[PDB]
Design a protein around this nucleic acid. Structure first.
Ligand SMILES: Nc1ncnc2c1ncn2[C@@H]1O[C@H](COP(=O)(O)OP(=O)(O)NP(=O)(O)O)[C@@H](O)[C@H]1O
Ligand SMILES: [Mg+2]
Lengths: 247, 250
RNA sequence: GGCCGCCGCCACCGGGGUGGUCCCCGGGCCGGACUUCAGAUCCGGCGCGCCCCGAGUGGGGCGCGGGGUUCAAUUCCCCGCGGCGGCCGCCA
RNA sequence: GGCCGCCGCCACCGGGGUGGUCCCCGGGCCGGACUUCAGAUCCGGCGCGCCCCGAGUGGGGCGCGGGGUUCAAUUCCCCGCGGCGGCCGCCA
């Protein structure tokens, strides 16, 4: 262009402790080195702004986190640092991308439940180990249900991560193009002639060669009519009925 | 029921910490409070750029805005300028919520020391100028007067501050108590007022009264209007004539 | 900090009116009189500064940013300070 | 993860329609008028399998996932194969 390139929305998905926040910062840092304005957003920003947790804050948290992401994707790349364990959650974020016609990439961060538990402890078990175990089970494997849900990259956070390799791949994708009546006159003659035939065939017991003859007659009739300029169904449909009765 | 708390103080003064400790106490006092500041969105970017500031400011004000409709909001920001503090106040005014500016101060010596302990991400030089040119709140506008001034180098009784803020939340805001065209006396009573008033002005001129007798006439009208507002059904014309006559025999 | 608009500079609080030394509505508070008595209520009142009188308790006078008009300015006119709204400037 | 839906299996492609041996709309392509070249316009036509006739660079026949309803299915119903989506599951 200016050979083209643009900006997009990155959706992380993975369980607690898997490495989303850390991954985000690193991915974010490399993208900067690439003259790309990127910001990292997640529900935890607002959730942890409350001194304590209450189920009743979640509606504000989710709605607030979506506005930030929405208004951010208008100017910047956005890395959504969130678990997003339900596919419907990922769809919601994708809709924001679609809303602005931007590309999107779902990045799945994986780790054995063994590692997740170990890590959850190292942190203080603020989330019950039992909770980490259930979530691990309930997790919606990305792409298992919908094609739009297929992960752009699956990443094992138990091994090294080539943030340069990843940044490159994302940038390449950002250059791609995100793509995400009433019957007329001729249509009436078709629907009509067809009915007329149905009627005629039920009216006279006829031989096999007879049915086929009628059917061919209709075909020729339609052909001739698409030829004529101005035409009226009542006039023509009558001509058809009469031609049929002469057999 | 609920208000907007505006913190103001130089970098390293202890805002973030103060915020979190004040919030925790408020929660114990069954108050739904959230802590918001421009650093939340600013630090979400991997690097800093002057061109982000407009988005950061805009985004942060929207968060505080929509949060103040349901929760107490503690604005954890330097708010170096009173113009910023005014901006935050107008958000409070917009929902007719009470507000309180809490000023946190510490000596330049402490600020410099703290800034180092951090990593000097902010040039000492900068901390100094910010400190030197920083104008304390309330020196120019009364609405900018801090509700409390807290020295972070000394102990801080959070239960006290909380108890104080809660009392203040119950008070009535005074932003919109500037549009109360109510309690007007019926259009007729108001006519008698406006008319007797003119009738007196005419009388005073026609008899070139002195300061003394003028005051008597003024008092006479006061007594007249008092008596009239005690009557049930009344007609201006009849009443006004009665006043005129009264004055004429005076 | 600037420009534009509107408002305040009559004095318990809010609003309103108004060429009458302020007034009205709404709210609050203060003092006197209320049968050797308390007490709702009726009568008077409400800020600050200066001055004067009074033993004191207390009472009275002048003033309310500057200036004009006028017998008289809270009101009308010119300026000054301040508030609110709008737009801009500022915004490690 | 639960519940459910849509499109294709008529045949150049996509969308829509329909118990008539397919039709309509839009796009593309081959052949003809057309003859520098291209264009406009018009005309004829467009897939696969197996088989018969002729053997020019030709014509014809049966079939188009299985079953059913039927004279007739692209259409309606059951299943199969294929392509895809929707709602809800919400710090966990
Ligand atoms: N790539 C990594 N390899 C090993 N450990 C990591 C990695 N990244 C992060 N960790 C550690 O794993 C724990 C959680 O990491 P974090 O990146 O915060 O995961 P998260 O998904 O963001 N957590 P949460 O926000 O609670 O869902 C901390 O001890 C991290 O330091
Ligand atoms: Mg995290």
């Amino acid at each position: 262009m200016n050979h083209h390139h643009h900006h997009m929305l990155i959706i992380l998905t993975g369980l607690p402790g898997v490495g989303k926040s850390t991954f985000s910062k690193n991915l974010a840092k490399i993208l900067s080195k690439n003259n790309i304005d990127v910001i990292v957003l997640g529900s935890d920003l607002i959730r942890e702004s409350f001194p304590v947790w209450k189920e009743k804050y979640e509606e504000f948290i989710k709605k607030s986190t979506y506005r930030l992401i929405d208004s951010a994707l208008k100017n910047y790349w956005v890395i959504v640092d969130d678990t997003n364990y339900y596919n419907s959650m990922r769809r919601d974020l994708i809709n924001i991308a679609k809303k602005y016609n931007k590309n999107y990439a779902i990045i799945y961060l994986k780790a054995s439940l063994d590692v997740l538990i170990r890590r959850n402890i190292e942190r203080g078990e603020k989330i019950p180990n039992e909770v980490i175990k259930k979530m691990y089970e309930k997790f919606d494997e990305p792409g298992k249900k919908y094609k739009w849900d297929e992960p752009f990259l699956i990443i094992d956070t138990t091994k090294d991560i080539d943030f340069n390799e990843i940044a490159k791949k994302l940038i390449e994708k950002s250059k791609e193009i995100p793509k995400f009546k009433n019957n007329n006159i001729s249509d009436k003659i078709d629907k009509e002639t067809r009915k007329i035939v149905s009627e005629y065939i039920k009216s006279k017991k006829l031989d096999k060669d007879k049915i086929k003859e009628v059917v061919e007659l209709r075909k020729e009739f339609l052909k001739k009519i698409k030829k004529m300029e101005e035409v009226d169904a009542d006039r023509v449909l009558k001509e058809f009925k009469d031609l049929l009765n002469s057999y």
